[model samples]
Target: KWNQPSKEGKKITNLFVNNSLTHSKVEFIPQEGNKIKWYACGPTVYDAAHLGHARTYVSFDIIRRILVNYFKYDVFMVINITDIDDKIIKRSVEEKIGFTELARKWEYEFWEDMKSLNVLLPTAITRVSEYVGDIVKYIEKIIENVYFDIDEFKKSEKHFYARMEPLKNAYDFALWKSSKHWDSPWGKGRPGWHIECSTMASNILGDVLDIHSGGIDLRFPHHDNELAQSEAFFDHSQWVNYFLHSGHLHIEGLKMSKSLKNFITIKNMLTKYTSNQIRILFLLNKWDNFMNYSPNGESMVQCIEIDKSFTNFFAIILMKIKNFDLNSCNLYWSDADNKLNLLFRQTKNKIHEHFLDNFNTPDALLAIQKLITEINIYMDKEKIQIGLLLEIKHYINFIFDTFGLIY
Candidate 1:
């Protein structure tokens, strides 16, 4: 079900992307052989999945597809769903529903939206609830004065509240917290935000991982804290090999957030545009760059126009094929045939080079469009060959799959 590497070297190499930790472009050298163990931070599940979330997940999904289908890499991807969180607890009380029930409701909504977008399901979908027992063991390894020795907390004289409370200060976080005073070795509380990821990832993928990805917002405390705790637990440095983060999505130049009441749900977005249209819109922007979804829905107009052009181009190819059987054998390379072949070769090389430069999806997409334009010109000026038609179609399918677009 996976395509072999398109390059003729018979080895996977030169794959590069921006590493958030290094703050530079780096090659994605897998930890063990050709197998890649990847983890992406999933939703917190306190509310509906928004367009911002869609941008991040979709961008990564395309990356995964390229690695699997284009570069011929074996990827074992895991995305964690945070079922227990401070937001979920607060929302549960506000909505008059149990916390688990509230979390499940939003979690299902997330899955539905992902399915609608045709995102590939991760190899393993994990939840915070499933790792609580294992998290206790994780905590025991890193539990020390460092987790609860804040000078601010010391002066304020507030004890570790919840093994469950926010790590506002080290003294407040719960390595083992209690929930309204109940049971268990670590009390009645669940795992904290940062610890949940470290525990779950280590339990499933072992101490070292090939890649860890999330939004740029997670850089400071969330990802940093995960790094610190994982290193402390394992008593070693280099917990993760590479870190990649997608840039933020904005709404009319403002950050999209629930607090600002400017966010659009993915399901709501689907009402106005098809899934392919949304994918086209995202392709126009750089994967690691911030993009604005205008309040006036102006971007949707551009997406619709582009999608129409793509559709018409495909129709033209079909019409050409119908008029002249371009799939026949015994075809030899003429001057026109040589020109068409040259165009495909140059386009393929340029696209491959662009992808090698930090997985530059925007530039790579432009290369694909250039190929389509060149092919259209060739068809108009010269007689089409069945051999050439079949070759170009094969190349186009690879491009479509690389971008997670409709073929």
Candidate 2:
């Protein structure tokens, strides 16, 4: 497989991110040299985080680790939690609890879910309730600066009402009405959903945020409105340098959503699968492509078997190296050693190629798996060479670290 269609001497030096705003792959350069300022949309605390949320956060976590460790960049990531929203109010009334009580409960629950998934914590965290005034202040500035269509917002408002979708075409840069009110200059009302991110990112990361990432579902009114408001407040264009959106995760046949009742919670999933296994499953799919999940599917089964083989491979390498006498061994090269050694180098280089090709994890994992099976087959037939095995192990461990597959 390595000899077929060899990409020898093809080297890529630039990292690329799939920029959702422009809908093209673009080079990733931080506004400030190697220092990256990234802002990712956090969870709305009305509901438990599901597989859909994991699809976004875990995928981004892998990319962030690669940026920091592999590319040698300093990353400052900010995540914002939505503690006050329309859904939280309605759910609070139904559950007969205080609005803060409902919000606080799910906020902690969301963090617990992320921890269980082994997602990296952000450098800074913002809560919508804590930054209400700042949100209002940003909105007040936008009131003085910007305007978009409201006639289309009114005309097409009822269409989204029946289907439980937001009127994303409604670029109505107006304040929202909230059942649980906060004191605003205009009146006692809550900030709109989109402006929360605008103010939160601005207060923490700055006006020109380097990277903004979220689910594909947020690209519409949610992210569009955020960009419009933030640029208006700062009086500059392209507040977000690169916008990244991870694709949607679907269940069996339909999209996973609370309304559809097809959602699987992270806590529930962990009871059946390890965090690493779940992350491996995520990494086997493209970072920005729609991934379908089915119970008892071949996809999950193959990842489960690969995890088993990977665990065994580590144990064998460690045991062999325990009392290995490197000085007593001859430094002669064997054919098996030469073959496996070449694969190790090719895999290392191919993963670099895959990362540059828009962080294509699916192809990256395929390369890793190809190397994995070759190593197993060679070990079965040929005598083990201590140096060659160690070389392979070191690269394998580095990749696992970058993938966030190990603790």
Candidate 3:
């Protein structure tokens, strides 16, 4: 799959590798051509989304930007809203509010944070409640043959409870749970969490998806069950071409949790840091590597300096090139001019190579920095020509655009 060329002439082999079924690096190929069908597990919408949520979504957003803007692929993205989840139910009960009210409130809050971060809105956002009928039909189709290894599931401590007391297997999960019976065909019940995603993806994006992304935590029981039911229903294998999971976002040196009183909400972080600063911090680490967001915001201090330097560079270039006409200046390839030209080409090639190697952003950024340093040195040594200034400015703009970084 990796050997195939992308529709845009780029090699699909260069894209991010999947965390394989057996947990090894494997190439990811979409089922179709340049038109990609994508799905990412969205927020459950029970409470305000936290920094961990931002980390995952922002990382994926960068990937999406690279695929579309850089590689020029048409991506059809769908994000499912688990609006009728157990968390939402419990939170609604605790707050003495209607389930819909609670879900809507937090869901709106979620979007506000996404907007603040400048994350692109997905092509389709399907709410779970809107697909209850489709979910029931899916359950009805797969329930008779659905069975699990009882002993294995017990050993694994899987989260789902077997609602059917006289179970055929102890590991059998309730497809139709007997909670918040919203007048469905399958008695008084709601759909299970895993089934909600499967049903939504199948209904909206067809039987197969090009890419499915979520946090690493979901790879176990949640994603595992989603795969089982989806494949079982369709009687097919490899329902998803690629699975991209974001690594955990740690607070200080430990996992962020409300129980530990170390949880930092997205709203709180927005008060302290700008969106570009936050993005720069996240980009320094690999997308799938565990990253720590320190309490004193030390993790983001370097981002502030980088942003300042970048802005200064852009200003200096603009001022130097102001009122300069390329048509009037004779183009001469001197030693310094040739050296800068070679460096620019090499930097572009290096950045492209880094992107191909699993979107190695840190290496790509270093390449950009190196090009900028060379540009500065060339400016200090030689009288800048309009042609050279325009070329340098073009490369700088390309870097900023490709990286989704601010000037």
Candidate 4:
């Protein structure tokens, strides 16, 4: 339900134009006070998480932290577990493990790895298997709304809707999708890949979410299937608002395809670079750009460089304070000179202006870099002042606390 609008509304209109691939109507209601609710498509838990996964989770984590910790918005987050998939099929065979056991093992491993990364835990972390009741209820509701369109399901009483089935393409989803679906009101099979997320998010948040996010790869069959299944079931559209897709980690400007073996895992990269280093690399790239994952390691400038530079800057500030003889300067907190007041005011004013334009992180980063340069220059002369250096230390500590680059 949309229509053309005046040129003044073009900004919102430009964002709303139909997305053919995702096939969902979206609107951005820029209501100032609305709390941001975020939902991310988490890993399927069939294998060890790679650096690509780290990029996805960490990127979103920062956005959440900025909103909640900085902007002071009430945020709710949810990550789903696609406990079964085509990859799970093969892995189950190789590990000689039952589907349930395999799912649990990989899921636990995922949690462990996430903890090691120090990422924030989501508000709710529910798995596909745990959502069987919601899935069954949702499928039944769809059929009740005349959306299922399954003639055999009416007489045969088995709810196995294969994608190939051709009855209005409505009941054509894998509601029960495995060779081994448990005994329920529906037939004995596993839920389809898309059905899990739709049911999971709907059950937790609502029929629609504020920000539906996922990796760039999930935009296709995975997210597409979810949109189709959810829409067809609900018999209406607009399941998500502000659809966000994170860019991919590529290789030498090419997508990291199956043919290319130059993949890097998170565990291996963490051994070589701290989580902060990886974070800086991620931030260096635009959120929409593809990050090339190389085995020799990223050639991009490291975040540790920024940290070291700032550390030296701190050293300079301390040196300046130590050299500024209190007897000579006579700049006490209770009795401050005009020069001390002027320096403190200038520092605070500069920081305030730099951080105000929608958080303007890139500018803030540049400012920190400049501060480091100035501090180094001052320290090189050994003419630093004591009160001024202490003030500088306080300011730099505040900035570093916000950057969160350390640890």
lDDT of 3: 0.75
> Which candidate would rank higher by lDDT, 2 or 4?
2
Q: How do the residues 320-355 of candidate 1 rate in per-residue lDDT, one tens digit apiece?
A: 776785356446677878887898899888888887
Question: In candidate 1, which residue ranges exceed 4 Å CA deviation?
Answer: 1-12, 144-174, 326-332
Stretches of candidate 4 off by over 4 Å are 1-32, 146-173, 178-180, 231-236, 298-301, 314-328, 332-364, 378-403
- In candidate 4, what are the lDDT values of residues 1-407, reduced to their tens digit? 32212234222212231222234433434222445566789897776777778778876765565556544556789998888677787789998888778888878887876766667899998777788788888888766751234454344332222221122564444655645455557557667667778888877787556677778777765665565566555555555545666778876766655467656667777777766667666655544446675556545355668656666666656656556665665434432334444655665656555444333345556666766566565556544455556766776666555544552
Ranking by lDDT: 2, 1, 3, 4
How much lDDT does each candidate structure score?
0.76, 0.77, 0.75, 0.61
Candidate 3 ranges beyond 4 A from true positions: 1-13, 144-167, 323-330
Q: Write the per-residue lDDT of candidate 3 for residues 244-361, one digit (tens) a residue.
A: 7888988878987768977788898899888888777777888878887777768878888877778877887887788556677656778778878888888878887777776677
Q: Supply every candidate's count of residue pairs whose N, Cα or C atoms clash at under 3 angstroms.
A: 4, 0, 0, 6
**Pairs in clash, predicted candidate 3:** none
Each candidate structure's TM-score, on Cα atoms with residue i matched to residue i, is 0.88, 0.88, 0.89, 0.74
Which prediction has the highest lDDT against the true structure?
2
Worst 10 residues of 1 by lDDT: 156-165
lDDT of 3 at 336: 79
Instruction: Please identify which of the two predictions, 2 or 4, would achieve the higher TM-score against the true structure.
Output: 2
Give the per-residue Cα lDDT of candidate 4 at 392: 69
